[PDB]
């Protein structure tokens, strides 16, 4: 779950996805799916690829959007 | 039977002029056509398989300033590698999350594999809606 990652580990995962730093499209899709499952955010992959106007869609931007959404919704945060 | 999509072939065909919302069209009607400018880059080239051709289509999208114009930077990183870009969440189906290239006339019914005029770009959702109505 997301609480098994530190914020640093989660920023590395998001950066992998945003840069497409994977061996194959299949691997990238698996990573995005895992990201969706960790965040639990209703927008799923749209956080990365179809961000709401005004959201910071850089890797640290997405990490912060996730962090704040989870906080607003009474969900667990990152390890540490 | 031996699968034609897994054998080499030569890209042919013309595609069609498209605009800025081209990928928006992929979730409507019979999907979007291959853009003419991509057909122009790929026509007469030999591909090892349909999956090789598909990677070339997305590589060409990455190189065309107009066709990649409304991809966001993360989407651009993906297509620059030959990956198909992610559709909006509302157009995904299960683990099918990216735009799909499909044959309009089925290969089994005489449609050609690498004929760019026989290929459509659809979201997973639009493809599935079309298929379930057959």
Swiss-Prot record, chain A:
MF GO annotations: protein domain specific binding; toxic substance binding
GO terms under cellular component: protein-containing complex
Record-linked Gene3D superfamilies: Colicin E immunity protein (1.10.1200.20)
One record GO biological process: bacteriocin immunity
Pfam families from the UniProt entry: Colicin_Pyocin
Keyword Ion transport among record annotations: no
Keyword field: Bacteriocin immunity, Plasmid
Keyword hit for Cell membrane: no
Homology family: Belongs to the colicins ColE2/ColE8/ColE9 and pyocins S1/S2 family.
Function: This protein is able to protect a cell, which harbors the plasmid ColE9 encoding colicin E9, against colicin E9, it binds specifically to the DNase-type colicin and inhibits its bactericidal activity.
Protein name as it appears in the record: Colicin-E9 immunity protein
Swiss-Prot record, chain B:
Binding site for Zn(2+): 102, 127, 131
Domain of life: Bacteria
Low complexity composition bias: residue spans: 68-81
Stretches with biased composition (Basic and acidic residues): 17-28
Region (Disordered): 62-94
Family of this protein: Belongs to the colicin/pyosin nuclease family.
Protein purpose: This plasmid-coded bactericidal protein is an endonuclease active on both single- and double-stranded DNA but with undefined specificity. Colicins are polypeptide toxins produced by and active against E.coli and closely related bacteria.
Name of protein: Colicin-E9
Organism: Escherichia coli
Gene name tied to this protein: col
Residues of the full protein shown: 450 to 582 of 582
